[PDB]
Write an enzyme that holds these catalytic residues in place. Sequence first.
Site, PDB file in Angstrom:
ATOM      1  N   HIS A 199       0.802  -1.218   0.000  1.00  0.00           N
ATOM      2  CA  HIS A 199       0.000   0.000   0.000  1.00  0.00           C
ATOM      3  C   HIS A 199       0.852   1.295   0.000  1.00  0.00           C
ATOM      4  O   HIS A 199       0.277   2.371  -0.138  1.00  0.00           O
ATOM      5  CB  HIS A 199      -1.077   0.013   1.105  1.00  0.00           C
ATOM      6  CG  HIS A 199      -0.594   0.168   2.517  1.00  0.00           C
ATOM      7  ND1 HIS A 199      -0.157   1.393   3.008  1.00  0.00           N
ATOM      8  CD2 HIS A 199      -0.623  -0.722   3.537  1.00  0.00           C
ATOM      9  CE1 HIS A 199       0.127   1.189   4.286  1.00  0.00           C
ATOM     10  NE2 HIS A 199      -0.124  -0.071   4.649  1.00  0.00           N
ATOM     11  N   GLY A 230       2.063   5.857  10.676  1.00  0.00           N
ATOM     12  CA  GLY A 230       3.462   5.696  10.298  1.00  0.00           C
ATOM     13  C   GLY A 230       4.099   4.384  10.734  1.00  0.00           C
ATOM     14  O   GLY A 230       5.244   4.096  10.371  1.00  0.00           O
ATOM     15  N   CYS A 282       3.232   1.345   9.794  1.00  0.00           N
ATOM     16  CA  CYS A 282       3.142   0.324   8.739  1.00  0.00           C
ATOM     17  C   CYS A 282       4.524  -0.168   8.332  1.00  0.00           C
ATOM     18  O   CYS A 282       5.441   0.638   8.155  1.00  0.00           O
ATOM     19  CB  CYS A 282       2.358   0.842   7.534  1.00  0.00           C
ATOM     20  SG  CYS A 282       0.751   1.576   7.951  1.00  0.00           S
TER      21      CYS A 282
HETATM   22  C1  LIG Z   1       0.973   3.413   8.270  1.00  0.00           C
HETATM   23  C2  LIG Z   1      -0.174   4.343   8.749  1.00  0.00           C
HETATM   24  C3  LIG Z   1      -1.486   3.952   8.128  1.00  0.00           C
HETATM   25  O1  LIG Z   1      -1.786   4.329   7.002  1.00  0.00           O
HETATM   26  N1  LIG Z   1      -2.379   3.149   8.895  1.00  0.00           N
HETATM   27  C4  LIG Z   1      -3.607   2.633   8.405  1.00  0.00           C
HETATM   28  O2  LIG Z   1      -4.276   1.886   9.101  1.00  0.00           O
HETATM   29  C5  LIG Z   1      -4.033   3.002   6.985  1.00  0.00           C
HETATM   30  C6  LIG Z   1      -5.204   3.981   6.905  1.00  0.00           C
HETATM   31  O3  LIG Z   1      -6.302   3.256   6.290  1.00  0.00           O
HETATM   32  C7  LIG Z   1      -5.847   2.051   5.807  1.00  0.00           C
HETATM   33  C8  LIG Z   1      -6.581   1.105   5.114  1.00  0.00           C
HETATM   34  C9  LIG Z   1      -5.925  -0.015   4.630  1.00  0.00           C
HETATM   35  C10 LIG Z   1      -4.569  -0.160   4.854  1.00  0.00           C
HETATM   36 CL1  LIG Z   1      -3.745  -1.546   4.199  1.00  0.00          CL
HETATM   37  C11 LIG Z   1      -3.844   0.770   5.576  1.00  0.00           C
HETATM   38  C12 LIG Z   1      -4.504   1.888   6.073  1.00  0.00           C
HETATM   39  C13 LIG Z   1      -2.076   2.893  10.288  1.00  0.00           C
HETATM   40  C14 LIG Z   1      -1.560   1.662  10.689  1.00  0.00           C
HETATM   41  N2  LIG Z   1      -1.542   1.210  11.951  1.00  0.00           N
HETATM   42  C15 LIG Z   1      -2.052   1.996  12.890  1.00  0.00           C
HETATM   43  C16 LIG Z   1      -2.636   3.263  12.638  1.00  0.00           C
HETATM   44  C17 LIG Z   1      -3.204   4.069  13.657  1.00  0.00           C
HETATM   45  C18 LIG Z   1      -3.762   5.279  13.356  1.00  0.00           C
HETATM   46  C19 LIG Z   1      -3.779   5.744  12.045  1.00  0.00           C
HETATM   47  C20 LIG Z   1      -3.240   4.999  11.034  1.00  0.00           C
HETATM   48  C21 LIG Z   1      -2.653   3.732  11.292  1.00  0.00           C
END
Ligand SMILES: *CCC(=O)N(C(=O)[C@@H]1COc2ccc(Cl)cc21)c1cncc2ccccc12
Lengths: 301, 305
Positions: free
Chosen positions: B41, B143, B145
């Site tokens: 992604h 951030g 990921c």
């Molecule tokens: C790496 C930050 C990120 O984008 N995170 C996501 O969860 C994103 C936002 O919407 C999504 C949908 C699908 C995917 Cl594959 C990825 C994302 C991220 C990751 N882990 C924790 C997080 C906590 C708060 C905000 C974003 C976060």
Amino acid sequence: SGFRKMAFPSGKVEGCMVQVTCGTTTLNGLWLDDVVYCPRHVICTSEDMLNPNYEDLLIRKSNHNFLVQAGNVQLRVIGHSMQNCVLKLKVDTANPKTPKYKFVRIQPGQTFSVLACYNGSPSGVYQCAMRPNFTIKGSFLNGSCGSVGFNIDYDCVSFCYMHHMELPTGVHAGTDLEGNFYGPFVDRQTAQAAGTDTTITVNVLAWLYAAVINGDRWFLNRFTTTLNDFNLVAMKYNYEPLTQDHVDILGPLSAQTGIAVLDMCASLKELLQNGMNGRTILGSALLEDEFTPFDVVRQCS
Amino acid sequence: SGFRKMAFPSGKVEGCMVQVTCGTTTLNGLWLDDVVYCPRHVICTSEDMLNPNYEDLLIRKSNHNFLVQAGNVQLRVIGHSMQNCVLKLKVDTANPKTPKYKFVRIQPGQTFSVLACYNGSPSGVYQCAMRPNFTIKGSFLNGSCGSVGFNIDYDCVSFCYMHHMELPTGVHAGTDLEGNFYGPFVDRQTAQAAGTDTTITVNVLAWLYAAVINGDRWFLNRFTTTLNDFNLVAMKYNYEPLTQDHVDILGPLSAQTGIAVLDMCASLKELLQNGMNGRTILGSALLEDEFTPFDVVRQCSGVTF
Ligand SMILES: *CCC(=O)N(C(=O)[C@@H]1COc2ccc(Cl)cc21)c1cncc2ccccc12
Ligand SMILES: *CCC(=O)N(C(=O)[C@@H]1COc2ccc(Cl)cc21)c1cncc2ccccc12
């Protein structure tokens, strides 16, 4: 989102762990630049330390009596000195993996990561707090002496603890990296007991703010309290007094969540009176006190 | 004495973390030999996350679009390919800090250490478990990921998880290092929900054995039960079934403490039907299920890495 007990990454400390052997005693040492730091009781036997005279035992030692091992490489000791309860072994090689570091003495309620070692080899990493009674509730076995506690705030490692012993209740006692014990403890096998422990009130409040930041509000109430009325209730549940310093420290979390410190204090009084009633806060059924106000801001924001 | 939630020392993994930037998206990558692994992604923008054709988006990218940073050194990407939900960026330099490693896929109930990173820099380490609903109850912010989960066996790092997303309940979802998701999740912005979670029964039993080793015996009783009678009770309380495999795995702890597995199950049964009654076990008022039987032996014997 989420709230976990989180340790600092241990890599900068792993590259400093060595094994120190003197006679039949083996423990861990911290190799920084050309000095290896370790508990001074490495020069005692189990029968030597009901009443050891460390100055007397150290004078009888020579550099070649101390065997230091870094990986599969034996280091050569070229000098030895004692600073309070820590032995400093001068070696002929500066550790190339020496990080930027400082020796800091912490206060009760402060948290740190522990790198548990046996025979100079790191086995695990966990998070700890210096209890108000100056003990730490660690997880240590025979051979863990010399394992260190640390914090890594921006590239620099602040070493705050070195493990020395286990008290009869299973709790642990140690020193700062200058060899000064935390608490009224001595590095002797004499009868020693941890004083009655209390809950770190400021840390519980910080953790209730962490729960609000994570969307949990069930424990909040419409009440406030005076600081003195809070302390009068807190002492009855073996909670540490909350000072104006603690109230000031909680200011940023108060500003972020929109809940005054004395307002959160009234929620804490209610939790202590009622219990949780089958509910949890951040996945816990007890009030957690090993997250400082600084830890909460770092993990949540 | 003492029992703590303990992670593996993170040093071998810290030397592998890098920052990967593609367009406006920045996340973490795992640099092993001459390949950087990261969530696919990273190539996504606005509508590219809502409805993504990853083959189509990746074909439009060139090697110079991917900025990889290892410390204060920029690495040069010389190739790119996709394997399931992971992007593999071929770089010109083999990571000199590459440890002995394997990619392993874990099963629910298994535990692992997470090295949480932001901008290719490790910030924290914690121990957690793959829940039976395939989520992890992690601690991650924007951030994170590309942060990885791992275990250590002797001197070999087994990478088992890569962080991709956060679900609406605050729980986390990710893949193995081959890009296959754990659970019924997809890497896109869409309605996804974690299934109802269950307690990891074998881990609770291992943790009750750890408490006995540490001198906590109040919960023990004279009783024993059958695996079938226990599984009937366990199902009633949203506990995972206990198989004969689990019973065999608990054998060494049973031998050490003198408490047969079905004897410890009768203690667990009473705990479920009656509660703790104001008492705690290892400083907890809840039954802890994120220590496996191997974690308990490792900590109550001092195995090093
Ligand atoms: C790496 C930050 C990120 O984008 N995170 C996501 O969860 C994103 C936002 O919407 C999504 C949908 C699908 C995917 Cl594959 C990825 C994302 C991220 C990751 N882990 C924790 C997080 C906590 C708060 C905000 C974003 C976060
Ligand atoms: C390094 C292992 C060790 O010797 N531990 C001690 O507590 C020793 C034994 O008696 C002592 C009295 C005074 C001092 Cl300063 C040191 C010791 C040790 C340390 N940490 C945890 C332990 C658990 C079980 C046994 C010994 C332990």
